[PDB]
Design an enzyme around this catalytic site. Structure first.
Site, PDB file in Angstrom:
ATOM      1  CB  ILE A  45      -1.033   0.057   1.161  1.00  0.00           C
ATOM      2  CG1 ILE A  45      -0.311   0.121   2.513  1.00  0.00           C
ATOM      3  CG2 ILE A  45      -2.056  -1.072   1.049  1.00  0.00           C
ATOM      4  CD1 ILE A  45      -1.231   0.255   3.690  1.00  0.00           C
ATOM      5  N   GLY A  46       2.033   1.287   0.528  1.00  0.00           N
ATOM      6  CA  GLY A  46       2.781   2.526   0.613  1.00  0.00           C
ATOM      7  C   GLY A  46       4.094   2.415   1.346  1.00  0.00           C
ATOM      8  CB  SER A  47       7.066   3.713   1.765  1.00  0.00           C
ATOM      9  OG  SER A  47       7.395   2.463   1.183  1.00  0.00           O
ATOM     10  N   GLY A  48       6.602   4.370   4.759  1.00  0.00           N
ATOM     11  CA  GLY A  48       6.934   5.388   5.746  1.00  0.00           C
ATOM     12  C   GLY A  48       8.334   5.893   5.460  1.00  0.00           C
ATOM     13  N   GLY A  67      10.186   1.607   6.207  1.00  0.00           N
ATOM     14  CA  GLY A  67       9.087   0.648   6.051  1.00  0.00           C
ATOM     15  C   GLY A  67       8.293   0.600   4.752  1.00  0.00           C
ATOM     16  CB  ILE A  68       7.340  -1.923   2.177  1.00  0.00           C
ATOM     17  CG1 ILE A  68       6.056  -2.240   1.285  1.00  0.00           C
ATOM     18  CG2 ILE A  68       8.074  -3.140   2.778  1.00  0.00           C
ATOM     19  CD1 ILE A  68       6.249  -2.790  -0.143  1.00  0.00           C
ATOM     20  CB  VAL A  69       2.745   0.010   4.913  1.00  0.00           C
ATOM     21  CG1 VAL A  69       1.474  -0.307   5.710  1.00  0.00           C
ATOM     22  CG2 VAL A  69       3.676   0.963   5.664  1.00  0.00           C
ATOM     23  CG  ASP A 112       7.693  14.132   6.352  1.00  0.00           C
ATOM     24  OD1 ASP A 112       7.868  15.061   5.506  1.00  0.00           O
ATOM     25  OD2 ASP A 112       7.654  12.932   6.062  1.00  0.00           O
TER      26      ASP A 112
END
Lengths: 10, 355
Positions: free
Chosen positions: B26-29, B32-34, B145
């Site tokens: 779904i995305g990133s931080g 992290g991949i999530v 951020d």
């Protein structure tokens, strides 16, 4: 003034 | 047989509790991949964030720890919720991966920015972002951020903030870590920062919501400054004086700019019909916009001021807006240098506690 309770993410 | 299991998601391996099923990227931080996942037990969607051997570096460990700490400690309906943490490794020697399970909202702001909100919605979302931020500040913590993609919404119109890897107390004591378009002057220009750095970010976010697109695009870290002055006009010499000399020279060297008024930055054309009663007015939005998007942090409005602002306070509720601070045990102080292995230790202890 009411808080909305819907939000359209169609 | 065992508690964990494994799925390849592209080139990434998720090793997670059997409860979590049907993972989807779904995305990133910052780290992290999530994945989105089904929690078969609780019978609800969740978000799993893998932190890969975070002790592998000062950076990664610092950010991971914070994120671990802050996610445990924080509690507010506008911060994204902790649900679970674990490692699939069986010991401080085996250990490499952290996993964090959080609630999954419906969308990040990406997203809303494109649709055309009525005032009550636009003002409501802002109000929710701010109570969230007041919650962090309330305990000395700056998010640093905030940006559309760190803010998630749900179709009941609720809103939460996200990703604390960046999050620490006040400034100076690396430059290109906060997302370019949302960088406050104090961050672009290297002068260090206080809690209202988050306010600059909000100003940009609000602006975008109305603008339909990024407020100060800016094609690199330097052009970024151009966009800011092209719009708001050249800061005062009173300001320039606080600029470090190397940077001071460049800045004073720019073409001078008057800057547009907020009425011109943000005409009525752009706003919805004005709402039922008084304070949800395009012009009130402008007034607020003009107190957040101010180059000089020392003349910039705070969260508590922003909540007080007539455009935002029509929702004001003390139990959302004046909650008890999250409690940070004075142990964790978002700055210390540790080591290679003092880190691997800290996180482990901290994941161990949290399992």
């Amino acid at each position: 003034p009411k808080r909305p309770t819907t939000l359209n993410l169609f | 047989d065992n508690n964990f299991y494994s799925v390849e998601i592209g080139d990434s391996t998720f090793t997670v509790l059997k409860r979590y099923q049907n993972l989807k990227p779904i995305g990133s931080g910052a780290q992290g991949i999530v994945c989105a996942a089904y929690d078969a037990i609780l019978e609800r969607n969740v978000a799993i964030k893998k932190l890969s051997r975070p002790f592998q570096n000062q950076t990664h460990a610092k950010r991971a720890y914070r994120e671990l700490v802050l996610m445990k400690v924080v509690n507010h309906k506008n911060i994204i919720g902790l649900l679970n943490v674990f490692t699939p490794q069986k010991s401080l020697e085996e250990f490499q991966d952290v996993y964090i399970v959080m609630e999954l909202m419906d969308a990040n702001l990406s997203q809303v920015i494109q649709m055309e909100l009525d005032h009550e919605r636009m003002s409501y979302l802002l109000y929710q972002m701010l109570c969230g931020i007041k919650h962090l500040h309330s305990a000395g913590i700056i998010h640093r951020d905030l940006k559309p993609s760190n803010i998630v919404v749900k179709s009941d119109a609720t809103l939460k903030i996200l990703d604390f890897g960046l999050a620490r107390t006040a400034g100076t004591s690396t430059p290109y870590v906060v997302t370019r378009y949302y960088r406050a002057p104090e961050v672009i220009l290297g002068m260090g920062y206080k809690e209202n750095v988050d306010i600059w970010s909000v100003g940009c976010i609000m602006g975008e919501m109305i603008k339909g697109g990024v407020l100060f695009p800016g094609t690199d870290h330097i052009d970024q400054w151009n966009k800011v002055i092209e719009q708001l006009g050249t800061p005062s010499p009173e300001f320039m004086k606080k600029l470090q000399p190397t940077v001071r020279t460049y800045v004073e060297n720019r073409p001078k700019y008057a800057g547009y008024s907020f009425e011109k930055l943000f005409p009525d054309v752009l706003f919805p019909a004005d709402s039922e009663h008084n304070k949800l007015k395009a012009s009130q939005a402008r007034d607020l916009l003009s107190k957040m998007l101010v180059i000089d942090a020392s003349k910039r409005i705070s969260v508590d001021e922003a909540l007080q602002h007539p455009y935002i306070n029509v929702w004001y509720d003390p139990s959302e807006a004046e909650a008890p601070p999250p409690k940070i045990p004075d142990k964790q102080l978002d700055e210390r240098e540790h080591t290679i292995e003092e880190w691997k230790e800290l996180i482990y202890k901290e994941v161990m506690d949290l399992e």
